[PDB]
Ligand binder design. Structure first.
Ligand SMILES: Nc1nc2c(ncn2[C@@H]2O[C@H](COP(=O)(O)OP(=O)(O)OP(=O)(O)O)[C@@H](O)[C@H]2O)c(=O)[nH]1
Ligand SMILES: Nc1nc2c(ncn2[C@@H]2O[C@H](COP(=O)(O)OP(=O)(O)O)[C@@H](O)[C@H]2O)c(=O)[nH]1
Ligand SMILES: [Mg+2]
Ligand SMILES: [Mg+2]
Lengths: 247, 155, 423, 125, 424
């Protein structure tokens, strides 16, 4: 007995909804112009709907201006309401963000994990979770690693927590020649150890989960090689999470 | 609603447009969401002519809101000495209490409005009045290192 | 601040004619729309050519009545897109007005309302004129009111219901239709002035001295009393200057929003004092709804005088009645009688059986005795629904039988709501 | 599906007693057979759910009454989370109450364990 | 709700049908050529209802009836296309009219019905005149009704069905035919005026003192009744204006839609009357069972709903008083659980040859007496199984008779239930 996708429900189109005074309001110098412009389409145009139009709808003009703010916009509020827009698209339009869409917002989002305001990290991470659950691990696996290597302490801990989030919901079943194994020891492990051996404890402690969520996926015997090279003292922290963690 | 426009004006402080709205018979004691009359709002933000205009048109000088705040509370909190004496002259409740147990004397003492403290005191403020936690205006001066206020409270 | 009026069914439409006839005489507006002469533009808009058009929609599921509008004295006054007609009427069936026929035209009607609301800048709300017992008046209105609570939800809506009366009653099922609309229109109406056609009949037989009144007779009397209530909105008085104030002054409970209107004086065309007319406001014979306020508690009370009136005479007549009668109020009321005056004289129609009076008054009072009127409908309803009589007509036009009971419980609950306030 | 797909258009006919009836007939080709060996069930569910709003607001008492039965026979097989997302929301509140009252009186697993009637190939199987 | 399509089927159908067109053509001021020679706007205000020329379709398996209509007075006015006639006759066999011969022709009729409906601004419904003891008027009429009911389900179906009586034809199969036809009407029509030949004879014989009434004599009473009940429909007026509103305020339970009509004053064929009756006199021809067109005693049952139509110039004040009087002075005869169940309407244009008149349409439970008579005659006939081979030979099943018998008895029981009902 197979199940249904409830997604069969007819789709809705939002392109006609946008107003003429939208592009200039988002591309304005006055912060409240931008905020209201974004906030309007979120509360009026996206939040109501429950399924966007798959057929013949190009959002990669709208999505690249959400990225422009999420990355560069100095107003943390305009970021927050934008990443919640990005999530809504990726959520109400599942199976759309194959590359052009997903990749247009991916590396901007990972840059902005730098934000430490709880509400904002909430919105950015949850949107990263959206682009992941419908594009995992297309571009994110590689680019997530890149930003674990980044200089800002916050982006390290948050992009590593991201790999942890993704890894718990990592999916089967090809052969064991998925993108995770092709780059497992070469890249994933070499980069997770950089987190495990960070100067900060709160950083290191994210690596300890992100390594014990890794062993859970790919066998505590396969990775016993870099386990030995690790401190006996760090080892029992890694094992601590291994015993609690589920994927 | 004409009672809601009179709140917008009395708050933001457009002295002239109060007279316009009141000449259209607006409710002088119109309540907003949280029970705040225009007299509350003008007394918070220091619009002396708007206070005296509303009072002489029959504004409830001792009106409370959803939290038991009278306009004299809010004037003594923010520190509007001009308005405090206008309210008191129009029969304000010098020893009014709000939901947290504070009197206007509590708020003027906490915010360091020594000039308003003395005015309230001379209108028969309760110096020994306590709040929820059990603290008087005198305890606040002891707790807040304000020897200038301790002397003004025992005068 | 431009109020839009809506007229549903023959009752609304034909009372509408009487009111806009009377509005145009009070404002010196011509049948062709011109004016040789602001506060009155609450109700009328203006053409570039100096023509004053009502802010009104006329609706009927059948041409006949609205056809006479647009081939009559005031055919030029309305834009033709304002007068909307279907073809099959509701046939005294709320179900057809609300479900079967009403859904075929509701969207056209809501669209034509948007065109009048788009011309308006600071729209206040809606005045709605309709019968109770009529199928269109009950069913379609209640539908339109539901949809106006969506498309204009954040603003006021006022009812002018025609309470049914066997002396002019066209249908057996008018109790059903009354209950059904009052249930579904209860949540969507902010205030509602009932008009008992029996009282208007009684008044016209006694004070206008007519043996068998016609509908024209009833309208002239009703339109006079409607004008008295809307005078504050059309001439910029002091009291009830906008639609919110009606709820502020008269409605101290969302559900209990049914004021009793009393109008004096009604003088045949074949002068009284300020005191004499104010005493007649507490005489049941001149009420618009037949009940006994002496058996009930007042939640509020407004007096709308108009004409040759001295503000001191009013205060004397008030003190007289506040001292020399026992008008019981509820304890949680401001027990102050609100007043407003408009010095312009009551206009009558040239030819009317109603005479021009020097001064006049219309007392709006939310008394609990108006529950008596709901009891009379509820009883008639109960007798027929006990046998499920005529119910197949409704159920066969898209209506669930349960809706009858859900409505009856809402009327029983309303009768309890009136009781608990008055004890 | 092929039988269902052919007799669906008749729901949109003038005569009520025909749509009254052939909604009863649709509902009992389901309660006795059911959806099995159906290529694209999603496409089929959409095609038979599409008219159910209008049918449930149809003038005829019978057309309505016999549409709540067809609703139940779809719930009786994969309801109610799905039908409340797709169809319960749109019906009169009184209606969706009766449908819930109808689901309580229903006992037995969410998809029926055994069909009251089997197909051609299925019976020998 | 404007136009009404009229149908007449069978001999009786076209007889009382043509008589009806004679009466209301005069009343509306139309001549046999089809031209207005009236003198009042109250006449052409709602002429669009029955006319375009009548909106009338003429039907019979008996081809002779064709000529009996056209050779009549207003026979020239009817549209030639709207005559639809068979080769042979049904010969008092309901099955021949409903299943065999009448069914073969019914398509041709529906084609004309469609044609006349096609060019209607807004149809109200239909109007069929026919007899129930016949083969064509009953069998093909009821089959026509169902065939329209399913082709036009958003419309009213209104019949003037005349009941057979031994006093007018000694044919014993009529109880069969009328029972089978009532089994149809209770399921297929919104309202049915029960014209009883038993009562038409008893009025022509006893009240009008005619020793041998002819069809023409009975048809005079009918045509005058029909113009009376259709007065609301044909002239401007507030109350009971269109067919649906009438049925809404007349029929509280779908199966109990058989009205007992009656009107006043009862006149002979072209006789002279004294001083126009007074309003209280007219009013006192309601319970007066000698004015009922159905052979039933209103005293023996209860009125569910009543419609009164007063025609002529008179005091609206006095009519209201007299009707409000007669209701409460006989309060035990009007059902209590339907308040304001009696409705009165006035039309200023009186009928032809009378200064005042009053028609009394009533849904009285006493009508069960009528269905009792038909059923007892049916059962007496059916228990001995007489003449069944006629019906069965035409494809009918013996079971049908049992179902129609039982279904009419359920109809009688229902009337008896609401008669004994209480408000308490
Ligand atoms: N006072 C007054 N009452 C009226 C007027 N017109 C109708 N009524 C009353 O309204 C009630 C219902 O009649 P209508 O309003 O005409 O019915 P409707 O709204 O047109 O609905 P349908 O005709 O069934 O489609 C009746 O009881 C009448 O007595 C009027 O012009 N003035
Ligand atoms: N009142 C009246 N009754 C008739 C007339 N002609 C026939 N009947 C009755 O109708 C029944 C016979 O049916 P009929 O209409 O003649 O047969 P059809 O031609 O097959 O419909 C008997 O009960 C007759 O008494 C008529 O002109 N007037
Ligand atoms: Mg009407
Ligand atoms: Mg014949």
């Amino acid at each position: 007995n197979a199940v249904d996708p409830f997604e069969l429900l007819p789709p809705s189109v939002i392109l006609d909804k946008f107003p003429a005074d939208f592009q200039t309001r988002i591309s304005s110098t006055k912060w409240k112009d931008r905020v209201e412009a974004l906030e309007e389409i979120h509360n009026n145009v996206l939040k109501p709907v429950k399924k966007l139009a798959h057929k013949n709808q190009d959002y990669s003009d709208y999505l690249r201006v959400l990225a422009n703010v999420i990355q560069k916009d100095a107003n943390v509020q305009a970021v927050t309401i934008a990443a919640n827009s990005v999530q809504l698209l990726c959520n109400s339009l599942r199976s759309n963000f194959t590359r052009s869409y997903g990749a247009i917002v991916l590396v901007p989002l990972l840059e902005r994990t730098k934000e430490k305001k709880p509400s904002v990290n909430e919105a950015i991470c949850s949107a990263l979770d959206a682009v992941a659950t419908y594009c995992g691990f297309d571009d994110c696996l590689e680019e997530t690693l890149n930003y674990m290597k980044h200089k800002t302490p916050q982006v390290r801990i948050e992009c590593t927590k991201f790999l942890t989030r993704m890894l718990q919901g990592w999916k089967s079943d090809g052969p064991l020649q998925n993108q995770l194994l092709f780059k497992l020891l070469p890249e994933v492990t070499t980069a997770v150890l950089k987190i495990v051996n960070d100067t900060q404890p709160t950083t290191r402690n994210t690596g300890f989960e992100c390594f014990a969520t890794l062993m859970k996926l790919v066998g505590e015997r396969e990775l016993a090689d870099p386990l030995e090279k690790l401190d006996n003292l760090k080892k029992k922290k890694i094992y601590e999470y291994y015993e609690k963690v589920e994927v | 609603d004409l009672g809601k426009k009179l709140l917008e004006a009395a708050r933001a402080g457009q002295d002239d447009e109060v007279r316009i709205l009141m000449a259209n018979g607006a409710d002088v004691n119109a309540t907003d969401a949280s029970g705040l009359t225009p007299l509350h709002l003008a007394a918070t933000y220091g619009h002396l002519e708007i206070v005296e205009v509303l009072l002489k048109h029959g504004a409830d000088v001792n009106a409370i809101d959803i939290m038991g705040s009278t306009p004299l509370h809010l004037a003594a909190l923010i520190g509007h000495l001009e308005i405090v004496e206008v309210l008191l002259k129009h029969g304000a409740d010098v020893n009014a209490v709000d939901t947290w147990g504070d009197t206007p004397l509590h708020l003027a003492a906490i915010m360091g409005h020594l000039e308003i403290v003395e005015v309230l005191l001379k209108h028969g403020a309760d110096v020994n009045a306590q709040d929820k936690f059990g603290k008087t205006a005198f305890d606040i001066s002891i707790d807040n290192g304000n020897e200038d206020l301790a002397e003004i409270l025992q005068k | 601040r431009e109020c839009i009026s809506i007229h549903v069914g023959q009752a609304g439409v034909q009372i509408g004619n009487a009111c806009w006839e009377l509005y145009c005489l009070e404002h010196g507006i011509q049948p062709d729309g011109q004016m040789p002469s602001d506060s009155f533009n609450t109700f009328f808009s203006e053409t570039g050519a100096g023509k004053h058009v009502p802010r009104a929609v006329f609706v009927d599921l059948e041409p006949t009545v609205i056809d006479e509008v647009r081939t009559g004295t005031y055919r030029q006054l309305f834009h033709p897109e304002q007068l909307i007609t279907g073809k099959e009427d509701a046939a005294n069936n709320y179900a057809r007005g609300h479900y079967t026929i009403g859904k075929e035209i509701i969207d056209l009607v809501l669209d034509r309302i948007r065109k009048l609301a788009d011309q308006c800048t600071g729209l206040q709300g809606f005045s709605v004129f309709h019968s109770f017992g009529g199928g269109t008046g009950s069913g379609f209105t209640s539908l339109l009111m539901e949809r106006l609570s969506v498309d204009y939800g954040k603003k006021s809506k006022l009812e002018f219901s025609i309470y049914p009366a066997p002396q002019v009653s066209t249908a057996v099922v008018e109790p059903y239709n009354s209950i059904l609309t009052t249930h579904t229109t209860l949540e969507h109406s902010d205030c509602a002035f009932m008009v008992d056609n029996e009282a208007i009949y009684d008044i016209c037989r006694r004070n206008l001295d007519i043996e068998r009144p016609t509908y024209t007779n009833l309208n002239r009397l009703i339109g006079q009393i409607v004008s008295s209530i809307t005078a504050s909105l059309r001439f910029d008085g002091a009291l009830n200057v906008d639609l919110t104030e009606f709820q502020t002054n008269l409605v101290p409970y969302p559900r209990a929003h049914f004021p009793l209107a009393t109008y004096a004086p009604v003088i045949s065309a074949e002068q009284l004092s300020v005191a004499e007319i104010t005493n007649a406001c507490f005489e049941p014979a001149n009420q618009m709804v037949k009940c006994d306020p002496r058996h009930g508690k007042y939640m509020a009370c407004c007096l709308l005088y108009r004409g040759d009136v001295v503000p001191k005479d009013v205060n004397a007549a008030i003190a007289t009645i506040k001292t020399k009668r026992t008008i019981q109020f509820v304890d949680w009321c401001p027990t102050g009688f609100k007043v407003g005056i408009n010095y312009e004289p009551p206009t009558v129609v040239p030819g009317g059986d109603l005479a021009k009076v020097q001064r006049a008054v219309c007392m709006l009072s939310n008394t609990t005795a108006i529950a008596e009127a709901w009891a009379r409908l509820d009883h008639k309803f109960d007798l027929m629904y006990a046998k499920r009589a005529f119910v197949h007509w409704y159920v066969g036009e898209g209506m669930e039988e349960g809706e009858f009971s859900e409505a009856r419980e809402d009327m029983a609950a309303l009768e309890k709501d009136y009781e608990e306030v008055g004890v | 599906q092929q039988t269902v797909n052919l007799m669906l258009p008749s729901l949109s006919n003038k005569l009520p007693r025909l749509v009254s009836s052939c909604v009863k007939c649709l509902a009992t080709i389901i309660e006795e057979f059911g959806f099995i060996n159906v290529s694209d069930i999603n496409i089929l569910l959409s095609e038979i759910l599409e008219p159910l709003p209008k049918l449930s607001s149809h003038a005829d008492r019978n057309v309505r009454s016999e549409t709540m039965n067809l609703i139940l026979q779809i719930y009786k097989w994969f309801g109610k989370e799905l039908l409340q997302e797709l169809l319960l929301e749109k019906l009169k509140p009184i209606q969706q109450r009766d449908l819930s009252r109808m689901f309580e009186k229903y006992e037995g697993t969410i998809p029926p364990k055994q069909q009251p009637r089997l197909f051609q190939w299925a019976v020998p199987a | 709700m404007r136009e009404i399509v009229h149908i007449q089927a069978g001999q009786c159908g076209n007889q009382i049908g043509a008589k009806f067109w004679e009466v209301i053509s005069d009343e509306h001021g139309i001549d046999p050529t089809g031209s207005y020679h009236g003198d009042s706007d109250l006449q052409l205000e709602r002429i669009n209802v029955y006319y375009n020329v009548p909106r009338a379709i003429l039907v019979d398996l008996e081809p002779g009836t064709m000529d009996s209509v056209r050779s009549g007075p207003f026979g020239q006015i009817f549209r030639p296309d709207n005559f639809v006639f068979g080769q042979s006759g049904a010969g008092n066999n309901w099955a021949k009219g409903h299943y065999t011969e009448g069914a073969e022709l019914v398509d041709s009729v529906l084609d004309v019905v469609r044609k006349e409906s096609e060019s209607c601004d807004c149809l109200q419904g239909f109007q069929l005149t026919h007899s129930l003891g016949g083969g064509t008027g009953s069998g093909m009429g009821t089959l026509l009704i169902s065939k329209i009911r399913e082709e036009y389900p958003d419309r009213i179906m209104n019949t003037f069905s005349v009941v057979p009586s031994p006093k007018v034809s000694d044919t014993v199969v009529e109880p069969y035919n009328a029972t089978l036809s009532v089994h149809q009407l209770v399921e297929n029509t919104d309202e049915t005026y029960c014209i009883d030949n038993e009562a038409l004879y008893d009025i022509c014989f006893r009240t009008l003192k005619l020793t041998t009434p002819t069809y023409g004599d009975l048809n005079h009473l009918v045509s005058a009744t029909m113009s009376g009940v259709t007065t609301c429909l044909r002239f401007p007026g507030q109350l009971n204006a269109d067919l649906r509103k009438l049925a809404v305020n007349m029929v509280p339970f779908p199966r109990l839609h058989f009205f007992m009509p009656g009107f006043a004053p009862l006149t002979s064929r072209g006789s002279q009357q004294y001083r126009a009756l007074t309003v209280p006199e007219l009013t006192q021809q309601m319970f007066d069972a000698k004015n009922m067109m159905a052979a039933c005693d209103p005293r023996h049952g209860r009125y569910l709903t009543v419609a009164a139509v007063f025609r002529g110039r008179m005091s609206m004040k006095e009519v209201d008083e007299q009707m409000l009087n007669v209701q409460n002075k006989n309060s035990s005869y009007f059902v209590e659980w339907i308040p304001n169940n009696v409705k009165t309407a006035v039309c200023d244009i009186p009928p032809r040859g009378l200064k005042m008149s009053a028609t009394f349409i009533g849904n009285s439970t006493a009508i069960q007496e009528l269905f009792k008579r038909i059923s007892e005659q049916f059962t007496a006939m059916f228990r001995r199984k007489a003449f069944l081979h006629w019906y069965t030979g035409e494809g009918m099943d013996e079971m049908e008779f049992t179902e129609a018998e039982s279904n009419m008895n359920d109809l009688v029981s229902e009337y008896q239930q609401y008669q004994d009902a209480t408000a308490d």
